[PDB]
Write a protein that holds these residues in place. Structure first.
Motif, PDB file in Angstrom:
ATOM      1  N   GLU A  77       0.852  -1.190   0.000  1.00 55.43           N
ATOM      2  CA  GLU A  77       0.000   0.000   0.000  1.00 55.43           C
ATOM      3  C   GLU A  77       0.887   1.240   0.000  1.00 55.43           C
ATOM      4  OE1 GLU A  77      -2.415  -0.636   3.519  1.00 55.43           O
ATOM      5  OE2 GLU A  77      -4.178  -1.158   2.340  1.00 55.43           O
ATOM      6  N   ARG A  80      -7.107  -0.902   1.820  1.00 51.81           N
ATOM      7  CA  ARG A  80      -7.948  -1.635   2.739  1.00 51.81           C
ATOM      8  C   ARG A  80      -9.031  -0.731   3.304  1.00 51.81           C
ATOM      9  NH1 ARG A  80      -3.649  -4.303   6.464  1.00 51.81           N
ATOM     10  NH2 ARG A  80      -2.369  -2.615   5.553  1.00 51.81           N
ATOM     11  N   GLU A  81      -8.785   0.581   3.262  1.00 53.08           N
ATOM     12  CA  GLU A  81      -9.767   1.545   3.745  1.00 53.08           C
ATOM     13  C   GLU A  81     -10.903   1.657   2.704  1.00 53.08           C
ATOM     14  OE1 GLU A  81      -7.755   5.502   3.638  1.00 53.08           O
ATOM     15  OE2 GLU A  81      -9.237   5.820   2.035  1.00 53.08           O
ATOM     16  N   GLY A  82     -10.658   1.138   1.503  1.00 57.45           N
ATOM     17  CA  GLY A  82     -11.670   1.183   0.465  1.00 57.45           C
ATOM     18  C   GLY A  82     -11.309   2.043  -0.727  1.00 57.45           C
ATOM     19  N   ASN A  83     -12.104   1.945  -1.790  1.00 58.26           N
ATOM     20  CA  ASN A  83     -11.878   2.708  -3.022  1.00 58.26           C
ATOM     21  C   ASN A  83     -13.211   3.101  -3.666  1.00 58.26           C
ATOM     22  OD1 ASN A  83      -8.783   2.375  -3.673  1.00 58.26           O
ATOM     23  ND2 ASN A  83      -9.482   0.295  -3.125  1.00 58.26           N
ATOM     24  N   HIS A  84     -13.258   4.264  -4.318  1.00 60.25           N
ATOM     25  CA  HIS A  84     -14.467   4.690  -5.017  1.00 60.25           C
ATOM     26  C   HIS A  84     -14.055   5.459  -6.260  1.00 60.25           C
ATOM     27  CE1 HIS A  84     -13.800   8.644  -3.035  1.00 60.25           C
ATOM     28  NE2 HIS A  84     -14.457   9.115  -4.078  1.00 60.25           N
TER      29      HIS A  84
END
Ligand SMILES: N/C(=N\O)NC[C@H](N)C(=O)O
Ligand SMILES: N/C(=N\O)NC[C@H](N)C(=O)O
Ligand SMILES: N/C(=N\O)NC[C@H](N)C(=O)O
Ligand SMILES: [Mn+2]
Ligand SMILES: [Mn+2]
Ligand SMILES: [Mn+2]
Ligand SMILES: [Mn+2]
Ligand SMILES: [Mn+2]
Ligand SMILES: [Mn+2]
Lengths: 314, 314, 314
Positions: C257, C303-307
């Motif tokens: 990351e 890991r916190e996410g994606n958009h």
């Protein structure tokens, strides 16, 4: 520096039979040969023969007090002798009750020694505060000066002399402490790093602290009493009293790598390895290998590697 | 202080059958008896009986909106009643959708409460941003004030009143967040500690920060909504939505040990334990024991030990 | 930015058969499709066909020198070509010996590149310092300028040109280093973070340091050669040379990351995945999934996410 391995195949410190086989498994795994590959001279003293005390009635709740008292009296004699000769003693044992004699003998030659106890347990229950008369959970209680006379005299331990105080011992790996023991560690002001402190601080800081706490003022001999159950059951499964949420393999080797660097290691104990408690041959191999790994780390083996001095590999 | 256990055997928050059995397993594991051994007065309210809404047609994509809306409205009533009486509520649940009512009821008595959400998921999807109409993944969306009106009204939730804002919630354990959810947490400025921050900072600093963030200015009731899938599948395998790379057993207890120390725990939810999803009986036992462990930790049990006050064990 | 996946089904770098199947498993796991879901352009170059050198006699102790020398010569050509076209190369391999060609090709277009080597091993043995003629353990020795001429010329590697120096490489995860290798890393002053440094500092500080060390002065292309055995066997069991006490899944993704965030990733290798060494189908799935996970992390997945940008999920 010389190293002396002393086998203590004793198991009367607790219920489960098998720990007495610990020394044989450790040797079978090549502990002695591997040690010789280090920069230390290795002498193997062999295993001690413990004379079984017949008609060893339990002192109130304490079980096999005489067999345990005599076995430890003999070990202390042997450890004192080797310490005397300037060697570092390495006790391969059965149960942790043998720490009584290991540290006692050690203290006789090095009275200013400090103790680092790696264990999921405090093993500081007294004959009165014990839910089970199992002596492998009361070693520290016989060694502490502040606990002298706070419990009746037990058959077979009159030879014992409180050699360390509450300020000379550091625990690392606590997670299963009885109420009495917790009352005792808080009351006596003993320094400890239970798993919550290990999670909070990280093993790095933990070692940093345990040392400034014990070595800051004066530099003195270090005695490392290692209860294999201090690691998580996933690493050292073949043990009598496993407790989830333990120290990891990495953290254990860190501890031993750091103790090696101080150059102050003077006594060592590798306890509770019970070859018969492995649910699968692999679980015993795992446990044994890890115990061997920790021992080698105490004596120089670095995960970053090692190379012999004065040798130009190029 | 008094504790009130409220069972919420509900499962319509998600597709997998079995979570409704969560409460029974937790009790069977001795949760109540063990709690009584702590310094708190424990009262078991029993499990709530949820009336099934017949002909519960799905609202667009949201499934069982009425059964879920009514089950929560009932729990909220019950939680409000117990909070009113000055007790700390402990919701043993099925799926996490029941957090809607747990927190709602709690907020009715303690409007200034803050929320610490331990989950591998943000559960902040709106009826419009869900890829699945599963409500166990949209709890926070119904509770947030900043999300009020950003989605159509759903049958059965008209009773709900946004009780917390984006500044009163802290997430710990994030690793499986949908694009929409990630857009929502970034847009709303919500504070979170995904696994990357846990690795970077360490759980110790993480807790330190989540408290100064939520408690720095004013000290207020803390509501802990704990999704068991927050810990790694190796620790809490019996759950409907496991995600690798989770919080460790040690870190979980740390979180709970720290929240206990603040003396501010006012509400609690132990969710997603699904006794039927254990590949082996051991996997269910593991999950259940860990959930119980965390609960006991929230109420005093320390890994360093505990001993009763005014009692001289010597 | 464009990404080019290059399959290197080669296994003569070591004794264990099966690593050549690594590329097929990685693809079967959906590596390519999943990559396409990221913000990068993905092109699959396919697997390279390696012509087997007949009568490949061992050079002293080194085995299959010609087959390994020619296989890498071909890969280097292919990697040079894609780098030339401004794409990031991704080598799915068999054994780690293929790093010789991956980095060599890469260096031809980007001579100022630095290397981050995640491995439990240093793979820096020379033809003279190996205990096995296994080339998968000598990759770095052919690439280092300071090691040029410190060993005889090997059949099939005359095309190789030392492209990086001891100051352009950082190791992370070391725990099984041979004496000769340890002599070499200490003598050359190479920078490394063995597991003891990872335990001491924490992966967060480790990454911080590896970057100021390699990027402090000038910002340059980063080549990540990832030996799957760098993570603990519990995470990547299906590998030829597993070593206990490795990096954790979490730490592995942290590394990837962080490398993604620099925006400097120019070349990558995902090596030693051996689909045939899994004691159970699950062990292979685990390994393959983790290798795919790390790769996706290198290219954006947080890991916190994606958009997706410009998309209003509300
Ligand atoms: N395993 C162990 N100590 O090592 N257990 C200690 C526990 N207090 C007992 O008194 O038996
Ligand atoms: N397991 C879980 N949350 O707890 N999943 C959340 C996922 N966003 C879903 O919308 O279903
Ligand atoms: N597995 C591995 N490197 O990746 N082993 C290295 C070991 N030095 C050998 O020379 O074979
Ligand atoms: Mn113990
Ligand atoms: Mn012990
Ligand atoms: Mn979840
Ligand atoms: Mn949840
Ligand atoms: Mn390797
Ligand atoms: Mn390698």
């Amino acid at each position: 520096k010389p190293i002396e391995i002393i086998g203590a195949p004793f198991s009367k410190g607790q219920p489960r039979g098998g720990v007495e086989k610990g020394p044989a498994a450790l040797r079978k795994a090549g502990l002695v040969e591997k040690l010789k590959e280090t920069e230390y001279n290795v002498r193997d003293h062999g295993d001690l023969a413990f004379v079984d005390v017949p008609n060893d009635s339990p002192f109130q709740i304490v079980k096999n007090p005489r067999s345990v008292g005599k076995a430890n009296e003999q070990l202390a004699a042997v450890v004192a002798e080797t310490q005397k000769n300037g060697t570092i003693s390495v006790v391969l044992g059965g149960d942790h009750s043998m720490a009584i004699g290991s540290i006692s003998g050690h203290a006789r030659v090095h009275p200013d020694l400090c103790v680092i106890w790696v264990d999921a347990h405090t093993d500081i229950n007294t004959p009165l505060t014990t839910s089970s008369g199992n002596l492998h959970g009361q070693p520290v209680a016989f060694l502490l000066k502040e606990l002298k006379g706070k419990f009746p005299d037990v058959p077979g331990f009159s030879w014992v002399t409180p050699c360390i105080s509450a300020k000379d011992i550091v625990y690392i790996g606590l997670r299963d402490v009885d109420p009495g023991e917790h009352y005792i560690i808080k009351t006596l002001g003993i320094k400890y790093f239970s798993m919550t402190e290990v999670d909070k601080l990280g093993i790095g800081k933990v070692m940093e602290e345990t040392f400034s706490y014990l070595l800051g003022r004066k530099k003195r001999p270090i005695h490392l009493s290692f209860d294999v159950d201090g690691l998580d059951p996933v690493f050292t499964p073949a043990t009598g009293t496993p407790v989830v949420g333990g120290l990891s393999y990495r953290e254990g080797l860190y501890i031993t790598e750091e103790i090696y660097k101080t150059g102050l290691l003077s006594g060592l104990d590798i306890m509770e390895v019970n070859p018969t408690l492995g649910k699968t041959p692999e679980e015993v191999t795992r446990t044994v290998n890890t115990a061997v790994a920790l021992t080698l780390s105490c004596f120089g083996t670095k995960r970053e590697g090692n190379h012999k001095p004065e040798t130009d590999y190029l």
